[PDB]
Design an enzyme around this catalytic site. Structure first.
Site, mmCIF file in Angstrom:
data_model
loop_
_atom_site.group_PDB
_atom_site.id
_atom_site.type_symbol
_atom_site.label_atom_id
_atom_site.label_comp_id
_atom_site.label_asym_id
_atom_site.label_seq_id
_atom_site.Cartn_x
_atom_site.Cartn_y
_atom_site.Cartn_z
ATOM 1 N N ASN A 1 10.937 39.433 52.242
ATOM 2 C CA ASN A 1 12.258 39.252 51.637
ATOM 3 C C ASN A 1 13.376 39.458 52.657
ATOM 4 O O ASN A 1 14.448 39.972 52.334
ATOM 5 C CB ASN A 1 12.443 40.177 50.432
ATOM 6 C CG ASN A 1 11.360 39.998 49.389
ATOM 7 O OD1 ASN A 1 10.534 39.092 49.486
ATOM 8 N ND2 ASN A 1 11.355 40.866 48.387
ATOM 9 N N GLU A 57 25.693 35.327 47.310
ATOM 10 C CA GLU A 57 24.388 34.690 47.420
ATOM 11 C C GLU A 57 23.945 34.145 46.069
ATOM 12 O O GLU A 57 24.186 34.761 45.028
ATOM 13 C CB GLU A 57 23.353 35.677 47.960
ATOM 14 C CG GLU A 57 23.743 36.298 49.288
ATOM 15 C CD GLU A 57 22.803 37.405 49.717
ATOM 16 O OE1 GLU A 57 21.887 37.743 48.943
ATOM 17 O OE2 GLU A 57 22.983 37.937 50.832
ATOM 18 N N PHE A 109 3.019 38.315 59.217
ATOM 19 C CA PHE A 109 4.216 37.553 59.571
ATOM 20 C C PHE A 109 5.229 38.387 60.343
ATOM 21 O O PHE A 109 6.417 38.055 60.374
ATOM 22 C CB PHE A 109 4.874 36.945 58.329
ATOM 23 C CG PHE A 109 4.099 35.812 57.732
ATOM 24 C CD1 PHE A 109 3.573 34.820 58.537
ATOM 25 C CD2 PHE A 109 3.882 35.747 56.369
ATOM 26 C CE1 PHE A 109 2.856 33.779 57.993
ATOM 27 C CE2 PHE A 109 3.163 34.709 55.819
ATOM 28 C CZ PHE A 109 2.649 33.724 56.633
ATOM 29 N N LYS A 145 23.571 46.687 41.269
ATOM 30 C CA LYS A 145 23.323 45.318 40.834
ATOM 31 C C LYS A 145 23.669 45.108 39.366
ATOM 32 O O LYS A 145 24.098 44.011 38.987
ATOM 33 C CB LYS A 145 21.867 44.947 41.105
ATOM 34 C CG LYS A 145 21.480 45.092 42.567
ATOM 35 C CD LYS A 145 20.023 44.751 42.795
ATOM 36 C CE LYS A 145 19.681 44.763 44.275
ATOM 37 N NZ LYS A 145 20.509 43.794 45.042
ATOM 38 N N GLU A 203 23.763 39.059 43.905
ATOM 39 C CA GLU A 203 24.280 39.997 44.898
ATOM 40 C C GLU A 203 25.529 39.477 45.604
ATOM 41 O O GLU A 203 25.716 38.268 45.761
ATOM 42 C CB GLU A 203 23.197 40.333 45.929
ATOM 43 C CG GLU A 203 23.435 41.619 46.701
ATOM 44 C CD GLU A 203 22.480 41.780 47.867
ATOM 45 O OE1 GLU A 203 21.757 40.813 48.183
ATOM 46 O OE2 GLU A 203 22.450 42.876 48.466
ATOM 47 N N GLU A 259 14.613 41.027 35.158
ATOM 48 C CA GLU A 259 15.279 39.736 35.067
ATOM 49 C C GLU A 259 14.246 38.619 35.100
ATOM 50 O O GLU A 259 13.051 38.849 35.295
ATOM 51 C CB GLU A 259 16.316 39.556 36.182
ATOM 52 C CG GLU A 259 15.745 39.597 37.585
ATOM 53 C CD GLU A 259 16.776 39.246 38.639
ATOM 54 O OE1 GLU A 259 17.945 39.006 38.274
ATOM 55 O OE2 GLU A 259 16.417 39.210 39.835
ATOM 56 N N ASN A 289 27.496 40.644 49.227
ATOM 57 C CA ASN A 289 27.553 41.543 50.371
ATOM 58 C C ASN A 289 29.007 41.787 50.747
ATOM 59 O O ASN A 289 29.710 40.865 51.175
ATOM 60 C CB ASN A 289 26.775 40.962 51.548
ATOM 61 C CG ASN A 289 25.284 40.917 51.290
ATOM 62 O OD1 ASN A 289 24.666 41.934 50.980
ATOM 63 N ND2 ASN A 289 24.698 39.734 51.418
HETATM 64 N N1 ATP Z 1 15.100 37.048 40.353
HETATM 65 C C1 ATP Z 1 14.615 36.533 41.487
HETATM 66 N N2 ATP Z 1 13.976 35.344 41.432
HETATM 67 C C2 ATP Z 1 13.489 34.824 42.561
HETATM 68 N N3 ATP Z 1 13.535 35.320 43.799
HETATM 69 C C3 ATP Z 1 14.172 36.495 43.824
HETATM 70 C C4 ATP Z 1 14.729 37.158 42.743
HETATM 71 N N4 ATP Z 1 15.308 38.352 43.146
HETATM 72 C C5 ATP Z 1 15.091 38.381 44.437
HETATM 73 N N5 ATP Z 1 14.410 37.293 44.916
HETATM 74 C C6 ATP Z 1 14.020 37.035 46.297
HETATM 75 O O1 ATP Z 1 14.146 38.242 47.031
HETATM 76 C C7 ATP Z 1 15.112 38.080 48.092
HETATM 77 C C8 ATP Z 1 15.898 39.355 48.261
HETATM 78 O O2 ATP Z 1 16.806 39.497 47.149
HETATM 79 P P1 ATP Z 1 18.102 40.393 47.261
HETATM 80 O O3 ATP Z 1 19.085 39.777 48.174
HETATM 81 O O4 ATP Z 1 18.611 40.683 45.850
HETATM 82 O O5 ATP Z 1 17.541 41.758 47.845
HETATM 83 P P2 ATP Z 1 18.122 42.996 48.658
HETATM 84 O O6 ATP Z 1 17.120 44.062 48.846
HETATM 85 O O7 ATP Z 1 19.415 43.424 47.968
HETATM 86 O O8 ATP Z 1 18.527 42.314 50.030
HETATM 87 P P3 ATP Z 1 19.629 42.439 51.175
HETATM 88 O O9 ATP Z 1 19.005 42.874 52.456
HETATM 89 O O10 ATP Z 1 20.271 41.052 51.243
HETATM 90 O O11 ATP Z 1 20.649 43.435 50.619
HETATM 91 C C9 ATP Z 1 15.931 36.860 47.691
HETATM 92 O O12 ATP Z 1 16.485 36.219 48.835
HETATM 93 C C10 ATP Z 1 14.884 35.984 47.003
HETATM 94 O O13 ATP Z 1 14.105 35.257 47.945
HETATM 95 MG MG MG Z 2 20.702 39.785 49.641
#
Ligand code: ATP
Ligand code: MG
Ligand code: 1VU
EC number: 6.4.1.3
Lengths: 261, 673, 247
Positions: free
Chosen positions: B241, B281, B354, B122, B294, B206, B296
Site C-alpha cells: 500500500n 486522493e 516486492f 478518517k 483521505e 467500508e 493529505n
Molecule cells: N476502501 C478501499 N478500497 C480499495 N482500495 C483501498 C481502500 N482503502 C484503501 N485502499 C488501498 O490502500 C491504499 C492506501 O490507502 P490510504 O491512502 O487510505 O492509506 P494510508 O495508510 O492513510 O496511507 P498514506 O501513507 O497515504 O497516509 C490506497 O491507495 C488503495 O490502494
Molecule cells: Mg493516502
C-alpha cells in the site's frame, strides 16, 4: 674573573653523580651497578673516552624546563674504549635519570655513537636499563627510537651489535636489542616485555608477575629471545669481554686468529 | 523567482533527506537564509552542507532527534528563524507542534491547526466530505466496537469489506474481509495491531472497491480564500500500500472527469478553509466513478511530477502563501504541458516481497543528470550510509517529455544510466514496470504488482534476441579484458611476443545452459557468433568506467560490469537486471568436465558459527538428538546472549565448544546429523 | 582509470568515535585502479592485509591494518605475514603503500612466550631496509613503537600523509595522563587539555613527521603523483654479504 671554570667543574661532578646519590643508593640496594661502573668494568682500564657529556634534553612541556629536571648526560653514558686492545663503541643507559627513559638527547647520543662506529668499522655494545619512552617528550621520543632502529638495520651485517639487558626494559626499548646480533640478560634483575603485568591484567585478565612475564629465565628457556643469562652484573660483564674476544671488528675483516698452544 | 518581493529572511527546515535539500534549493533560489536541523549521524549529510547553518538536535533515533519538539524550539530560538518548513512526515501533520509554534512569533509554513485536525481522523474526514457534497466510499459512519456490529455492517454493505484503522498512516492496519468469520477475526486482530502500533483502536468498515485507481488532485490555497487544482496524478503502482511509480496526467482520465474531480477537491478545500498546498486522493473504478479517500494536509512526496507539467514551484508558492500574499495564478492559467513520470529508487531487495529494507554504505553513487529530460531529488551522496532509523529511500527520479512514450523512454534510459554500488536497490523492478505491456497500454490498478507477479518478482525474462545480445556483449567484454592484459610497456631486455590468436572459442554458462561462442576482434569491432547467430558489437571498450555503452547490430545498450573473477564469473547489469554468467575457453570447459562437484558438508549437520561471540555454556553433549526450538548453546554476542535454536533434527556427533569460550565466525562448534 | 579520480566515499568512512571499527579493504578498493585487489593470505592473520594492486598501471604492494579484527593490533602471525611480503616487494622493485590504524601490539602471556619481540622486530626490519618507494597514509590511531614499525617517516620513508582523523602519540590519553600527572590527582581538566593538545595529527605535523594533512577524497590522486616522482629513487647503503634479520 669568569665563572666558566667552576661551571664546568660543577657540570662534570653532576654528570658523574648522575641523577643523585639517593637514587644511586636505591640502585645499589637492588643489586645493580651504575652505568659508569658498568663501563669501567667492561672496558680496559684507562681506555674509556666519553662523548656528549654535557648534552641535555630540550623538553619544555609539563614543567620539564625547570632546573631540577635538567640533568647533564640525560640518562645515557656514551663513548669508545678498548677490550684487550681492540676498539669498541659502548653506551650504557642510566636508570637513575627518569628511569632511563629515552628522550631526544638520549637517542641523539646513541645515534652519534652508532654513526661513528659504522664510520670506523668497530662493534657496538649496548648495556640496556631503560623504562621506555619518556612520556613528556611525546612524538620526539618515538622518533628517537625509529632513528636508532634504522641505524640498527643499517648496521646489520656490517659491524657486530651486542646487547646486554641489565635492568627492566619496556615499550620500544625492547625492539633495539631484538635487532642486534646477540642478546644477553642478567638473572633476577633484568626484564623484557612490550606491556607490563598491569596492562595484561587489565586486558587479558590473567595474573602474572614481572619475572614470569619477561624474566631472564622466560626469555632464555621458552621464548627464544635472549641467548644467555648470567648470575649478576660482574659475571655478565666478564663473560661479555670473553665473548667479545671471539668476534671480528667488521665484516671487512677475516675471522680472528689468536696464539695457540 | 523575483528577489524584489519581501519574504522571511530565515527559514528552518525541520526535516532530513531529499525533501530538506529540495526546500533549501528553493530557498536559495528565493534568496532566503536556511537553518538545517540534524542528528549526530547526519552531521555530514547533503542538506546540512547545503544549508547556511546547522543545529544538532539529538541522537540517531527519530523519537529523540527529529520528533524532539524541545530541541527544535531551542534551535529556533537560538537561530532566531522567522519561518519553519516541516517538509512531509515527522512533525508536518502534528497539531502540538503547530500550536507551540503559534505560541511564539514564528510562522508555520503549512495548513492551520483546524485543517490538520479536521483531516487527522478518517471518520471525521469522511463526514465532512459528505457534508461538503463530495462523493465518498459507501459504508457505515461510526466507530465499530464489537465483531457483531462489524459483521452486520458487512451484511448491509456487501461481503467485500475494507477494514481500516483511524488515523493510520504508512499503509498499515488495513485489511480485506470476504466472510463473516473473516470480518470478525480481522476486526479482532486489527484492534490488536492498532493497539500495538497507534493505540487509537478506532476501526472503520467500508466497501472495498474492486480494481481501483489511485488518482490524486493537487490543491493549493491561500489565506484570502482562493483555491486552485493543479491537474491530477496517478499512483496506482503500489506494494505494501505504498507508491513506487507515479504518472503526471492520468491516461485513464479525460477533460470532463478531471474538471469534476478538481472542482470537488476545491470545494472540499474551501470547506476546510485550507490555506496551503495539499492533495485529495480518490479511488476511481472502471466506470469512471470516483470516491473521496483521505486528504493529505502537507506537501506530497510525488509533488515534483506536477511541477513538471504546470511549470510551478510548489515550495515557493507555499512560502509566499504563508507570508500572506495572494495567489498569482488563476484557474485558466493552470495547463498541462507534456508528460512526466517519477520512480522511487529505494534501498531494498525487490526479490523479497516486492521490497525488503536493506542497510549498507554506498561505495559508488552516480546520477544520470546529463541525460535529456531528467531530474533527480536525492539526499544521498557517495559515502552515505543506510541506517535502520530512517526511511530507506535513495532517490526520486523524474522524467518529462512531450508525450507519455518519450517520458517512458527517457525514464528507461535514466534507469539504465544510474550507478548505485554498496546497497541493494529496486531499479530492476522499476524498469520492468515501466516497460510492461499493460503499463504501456495504460490498463493498471492498485493490484498491478500483485497479479503481474503472482509468485513474486523474478527479474527480466529476456527473450531469444536479448539473450544473444547479452551473450555477445559478455563475450566481447571478456575478450577485451584478455587483450588488455597483454599490453605491457617496452622492456628492452626481454621483448614481449604478443600471441597471434585470431578466434576466441568460448563456452558461456548462463542460468543452467551452456552456449558456444566464437569471437573475433577487428580493432574496436567484435564479430561474435553465438550458436550460429552472427552479431557485431562496437564500443570504446573503456574497462574502467562504471557504465559501458555498446552497439549491438545498431541497437545501443548500456551495461554495467558489477563483478569479475579470474575464474570466468561475471555479473552484468543488462536492461536493469543482474545476470551471472561464467565464461571459459573451450579447452578450459573440456578440462573442467573432469572437475568433481564440491559437496558442502558444513551446510547442515554442522554448528558452523553463525557469528563470532563468547559462549557461556553448552546445553548439548555428543549423542543428543536436537529438536526445533531447542537452543544448542547460549552465546553472548553484540552484547546479547544468542542461544540460537536448532531449527532441525539431528543427533550430536561431537562437541567442540566449551563453557565460556570465545569463538569467531566460521568455526565449527557442534557436529550432528 | 584516470589517476586524478576523486574518492569522496572515503570522506566519512572513519567513524568519529574510536570504539567502532571499519574495513580497510573498502579504502583499498576505493584507492586502487579499477577496485581490483589480489589479497595474499586473506584467511590467515586477518588483523593485517597484504596484497598486490595497480595504480596508474604500475604494480604496487599494499600493507594495511584491519581494525575489524582484534582492533587492528599487531601480533606474531600478522608480523610475519606482513614482513615476508614487504621483503618480497622490496627485493623485486615493487613500490609499497601502507595504511596505518594500529593501536599497538596485542598483550598477553601467549604473545610474550611465543616471541612477539622477535616477530615485531621482523616487521620493523622489513620496513626499515626497504629501498623501493614507500608511501604511508595514517587514517586513525598510531600509538607507540607500532607507529615506528608501520613504515614511519623516520625509517627513510618517502611520503607520509595523515587524514584529519589521525592520532600519533606514545599511547592513549588515559595512560599518558596517569603516568605524567601521577600526583596531581586532578585529571578532570588535565585529560581534557591532553586530548585537546595531543589527540590529533598536529604534534607530528608541526615536527615534520607527516608531509601534509590531506582530505580523504584526494588520497588516490596524491599517491599517484608521488609514484610518478619516486620511480627513480636510488639510495646507497654500506656494503655487506648479507644482513642478519631476526628470524
Ligand atoms: N476502501 C478501499 N478500497 C480499495 N482500495 C483501498 C481502500 N482503502 C484503501 N485502499 C488501498 O490502500 C491504499 C492506501 O490507502 P490510504 O491512502 O487510505 O492509506 P494510508 O495508510 O492513510 O496511507 P498514506 O501513507 O497515504 O497516509 C490506497 O491507495 C488503495 O490502494
Ligand atoms: Mg493516502
Ligand atoms: C614507544 C613505546 C612506548 O610508548 S613505552 C611507554 C612506557 N611504558 C611503561 O610501561 C611505563 C614505564 N615504566 C615501567 O614500565 C616500570 O615502571 C618499570 C620500567 C618496570 C620500572 O620499574 P620500577 O623499578 O618499579 O621503577 P620505579 O618505581 O623505581 O620509578 C623510577 C622512575 O622512573 C620513571 N619512569 C620509568 N619509565 C618512564 C618513562 N617511559 N617516562 C617517564 N618516566 C619513567 C618513573 O616515572 C619513576 O618515577 P619516580 O622516580 O618513581 O617518581
Amino acid at each position: 674573573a669568569t665563572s666558566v671554570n667552576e661551571r664546568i667543574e660543577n657540570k662534570r661532578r653532576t654528570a658523574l653523580l648522575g641523577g643523585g646519590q639517593r637514587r644511586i643508593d636505591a640502585q645499589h640496594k637492588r643489586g645493580k651497578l651504575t652505568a659508569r661502573e658498568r663501563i669501567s668494568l667492561l672496558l680496559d682500564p684507562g681506555s674509556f673516552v666519553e662523548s656528549d657529556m654535557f648534552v641535555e634534553h630540550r623538553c619544555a612541556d609539563f614543567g620539564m624546563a625547570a632546573d631540577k629536571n635538567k640533568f647533564p648526560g640525560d640518562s645515557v653514558v656514551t663513548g669508545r674504549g678498548r677490550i684487550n686492545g681492540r676498539l669498541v663503541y659502548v653506551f650504557s643507559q642510566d636508570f637513575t635519570v627518569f628511569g632511563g627513559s629515552l628522550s631526544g638527547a638520549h637517542a641523539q647520543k646513541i645515534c652519534k655513537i652508532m654513526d661513528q662506529a659504522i664510520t670506523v668499522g668497530a662493534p657496538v655494545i649496548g648495556l640496556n636499563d631503560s623504562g621506555g619512552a619518556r612520556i613528556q617528550e611525546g612524538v620526539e621520543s618515538l622518533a628517537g627510537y625509529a632513528d636508532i632502529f634504522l641505524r640498527n638495520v643499517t648496521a646489520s651485517g656490517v659491524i657486530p651489535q651486542i646487547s646486554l639487558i641489565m635492568g627492566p626494559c619496556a615499550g620500544g626499548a625492547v625492539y633495539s636489542p631484538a635487532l642486534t646480533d646477540f642478546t644477553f640478560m642478567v638473572k633476577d634483575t633484568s626484564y623484557l616485555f612490550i606491556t607490563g603485568p598491569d596492562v595484561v591484567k587489565s586486558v587479558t585478565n590473567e595474573d602474572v608477575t614481572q619475572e614470569e612475564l619477561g624474566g631472564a629465565k622466560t626469555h632464555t628457556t621458552m621464548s627464544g629471545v635472549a641467548h644467555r643469562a648470567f648470575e649478576n652484573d660482574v659475571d655478565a660483564l666478564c663473560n661479555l669481554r670473553d665473548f667479545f674476544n671471539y668476534l671480528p671488528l667488521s665484516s671487512q675483516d677475516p675471522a680472528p686468529v689468536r696464539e695457540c698452544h | 523567482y523575483d528577489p524584489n518581493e519581501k519574504t522571511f529572511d530565515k527559514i528552518l527546515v525541520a526535516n532530513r533527506g531529499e525533501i530538506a535539500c529540495r526546500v533549501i534549493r528553493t530557498c536559495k533560489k528565493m534568496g532566503i537564509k536556511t537553518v538545517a536541523i540534524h542528528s549526530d549521524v547526519d552531521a555530514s549529510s547533503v542538506h546540512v552542507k547545503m544549508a547556511d547553518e546547522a543545529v544538532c538536535v539529538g541522537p540517531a533515533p527519530t523519537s529523540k532527534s527529529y520528533l524532539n519538539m524541545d530541541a527544535i524550539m531551542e534551535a529556533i530560538k537560538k537561530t532566531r528563524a522567522q519561518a519553519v518548513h516541516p517538509g512531509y512526515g515527522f512533525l508536518s501533520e502534528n497539531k502540538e507542534f503547530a500550536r507551540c509554534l503559534a505560541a511564539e512569533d514564528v510562522v508555520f509554513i503549512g495548513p492551520d491547526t483546524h485543517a490538520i485536525q479536521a483531516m487527522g481522523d478518517k471518520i471525521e474526514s469522511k463526514l465532512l466530505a459528505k457534508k461538503a457534497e463530495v462523493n465518498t466510499i459507501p459504508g457505515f459512519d461510526g466507530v465499530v466496537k464489537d465483531a457483531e456490529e462489524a459483521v452486520r455492517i458487512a451484511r448491509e454493505i456487501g461481503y467485500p469489506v475494507m477494514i481500516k484503522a483511524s488515523a493510520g498512516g504508512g499503509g498499515k492496519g488495513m485489511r480485506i474481509a470476504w466472510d463473516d468469520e473473516e470480518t470478525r477475526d480481522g476486526f479482532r486482530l486489527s484492534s490488536q495491531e492498532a493497539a500495538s502500533s497507534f493505540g487509537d483502536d478506532r476501526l472503520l468498515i467500508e466497501k472495498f472497491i474492486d480494481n481501483p485507481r489511485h488518482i490524486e488532485i493537487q490543491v493549493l490555497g491561500d489565506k484570502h480564500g482562493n483555491a486552485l487544482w493543479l491537474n491530477e496524478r496517478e499512483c496506482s503502482i503500489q506494494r505494501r500500500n505504498q507508491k513506487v511509480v507515479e504518472e503526471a496526467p492520468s491516461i485513464f482520465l479525460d477533460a470532463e472527469t478531471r474538471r469534476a474531480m478538481g472542482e470537488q477537491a476545491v470545494a472540499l478545500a474551501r470547506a476546510v478553509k485550507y490555506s496551503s498546498a495539499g492533495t485529495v486522493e480518490f479511488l476511481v473504478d472502471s466506470k469512471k466513478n470516483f470516491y473521496f479517500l483521505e486528504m493529505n494536509t502537507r506537501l506530497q512526496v510525488e509533488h515534483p511530477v506536477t511541477e513538471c507539467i504546470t511549470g510551478l514551484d510548489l515550495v515557493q508558492e507555499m512560502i509566499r502563501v504563508a507570508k500572506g500574499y495572494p495567489l498569482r495564478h488563476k484557474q485558466a492559467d493552470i495547463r498541462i504541458n507534456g508528460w512526466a513520470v517519477e520512480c522511487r529508487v529505494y534501498a531494498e531487495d525487490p526479490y523479497k516481497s516486492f521490497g525488503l529494507p536493506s542497510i549498507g554504505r554506498l561505495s559508488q553513487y552516480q546520477e544520470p543528470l546529463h541525460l535529456p529530460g531528467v531530474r533527480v531529488d536525492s539526499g544521498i551522496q557517495p559515502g552515505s550510509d543506510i541506517s535502520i532509523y530512517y526511511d530507506p529511500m535513495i532517490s526520486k527520479l523524474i522524467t518529462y517529455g512531450s508525450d507519455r512514450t518519450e517520458a517512458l523512454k527517457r525514464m528507461a534510459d535514466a534507469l539504465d544510466n544510474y550507478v548505485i554500488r554498496g546497497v541493494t536497490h529496486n531499479i530492476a523492478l522499476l524498469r520492468e514496470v515501466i516497460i510492461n505491456s499493460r503499463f504501456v497500454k495504460g490498463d493498471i490498478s492498485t493490484k498491478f504488482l500483485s497479479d503481474v507477479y503472482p509468485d513474486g518478482f523474478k527479474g527480466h525474462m529476456l527473450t531469444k534476441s536479448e539473450k544473444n545480445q547479452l551473450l555477445a556483449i559478455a563475450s566481447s567484454l571478456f575478450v577485451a579484458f584478455q587483450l588488455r592484459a597483454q599490453h605491457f610497456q617496452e622492456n628492452s631486455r626481454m621483448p614481449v611476443i604478443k600471441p597471434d590468436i585470431a578466434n576466441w572459442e568460448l563456452s558461456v554458462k548462463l542460468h543452467d545452459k551452456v552456449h558456444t561462442v566464437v569471437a573475433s576482434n577487428n580493432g574496436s569491432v567484435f564479430s561474435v557468433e553465438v550458436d550460429g547467430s552472427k552479431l557485431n558489437v562496437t564500443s570504446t571498450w573503456n574497462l574502467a568506467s562504471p557504465l559501458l555503452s555498446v552497439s549491438v547490430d545498431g541497437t545501443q545498450r548500456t551495461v554495467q560490469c558489477l563483478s569479475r573473477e579470474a575464474g570466468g564469473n561475471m555479473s552484468i547489469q543488462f536492461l536493469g537486471t543482474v545476470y551471472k554468467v561464467n565464461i571459459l575457453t573451450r579447452l578450459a570447459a573440456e578440462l573442467n568436465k573432469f572437475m568433481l562437484e564440491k559437496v558442502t558438508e558444513d551446510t547442515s549437520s554442522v554448528l558452523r558459527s553463525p557469528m563470532p561471540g563468547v559462549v557461556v555454556a553448552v546445553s548439548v553433549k555428543p549423542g543428543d538428538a536436537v529438536a526445533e526450538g531447542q537452543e544448542i548453546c547460549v552465546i553472548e554476542a553484540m552484547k546479547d546472549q544468542n542461544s540460537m535454536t536448532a531449527g532441525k533434527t539431528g543427533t550430536v556427533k561431537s562437541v567442540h565448544c566449551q563453557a565460556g569460550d570465545t569463538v569467531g565466525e566460521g568455526d565449527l562448534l557442534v557436529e550432528l546429523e | 582509470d584516470p589517476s586524478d579520480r576523486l574518492v569522496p566515499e572515503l570522506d566519512t568512512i572513519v567513524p568519529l568515535e574510536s570504539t567502532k571499527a571499519y574495513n580497510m579493504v573498502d579504502i583499498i578498493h576505493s584507492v586502487v585502479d579499477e577496485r581490483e585487489f589480489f589479497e595474499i593470505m586473506p584467511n590467515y592473520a586477518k588483523n593485517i592485509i597484504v596484497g598486490f594492486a595497480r595504480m596508474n598501471g604500475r604494480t604496487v604492494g599494499i600493507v594495511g591494518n584491519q581494525p575489524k579484527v582484534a582492533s587492528g593490533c599487531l601480533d606474531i602471525n600478522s608480523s610475519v605475514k606482513g614482513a615476508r611480503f614487504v621483503r618480497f616487494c622490496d627485493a623485486f622493485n615493487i613500490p609499497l603503500i601502507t595504511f596505518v590504524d594500529v593501536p599497538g601490539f596485542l598483550p598477553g602471556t601467549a604473545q610474550e612466550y611465543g616471541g612477539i619481540i622477535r616477530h615485531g622486530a621482523k616487521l620493523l626490519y622489513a620496513f626499515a631496509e626497504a629501498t623501493v618507494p614507500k608511501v604511508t597514509v595514517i587514517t586513525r590511531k598510531a600509538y607507540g613503537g607500532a607507529y615506528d614499525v608501520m613504515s614511519s617517516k623516520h625509517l627513510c620513508g618517502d611520503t607520509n600523509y595523515a587524514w584529519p582523523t589521525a592520532e600519533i602519540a606514545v599511547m592513549g590519553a588515559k595512560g599518558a595522563v596517569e603516568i605524567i600527572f601521577k600526583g596531581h590527582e586532578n585529571v578532570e581538566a588535565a585529560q581534557a587539555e591532553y586530548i585537546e593538545k595531543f589527540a590529533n595529527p598536529f604534534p607530528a605535523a608541526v615536527r615534520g613527521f607527516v608531509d601534509d594533512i590531506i582530505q580523504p577524497s584526494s588520497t588516490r590522486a596524491r599517491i599517484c603523483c608521488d609514484l610518478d616522482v619516486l620511480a627513480s629513487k636510488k639510495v646507497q647503503r654500506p656494503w655487506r654479504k648479507h644482513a642478519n634479520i631476526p628470524l
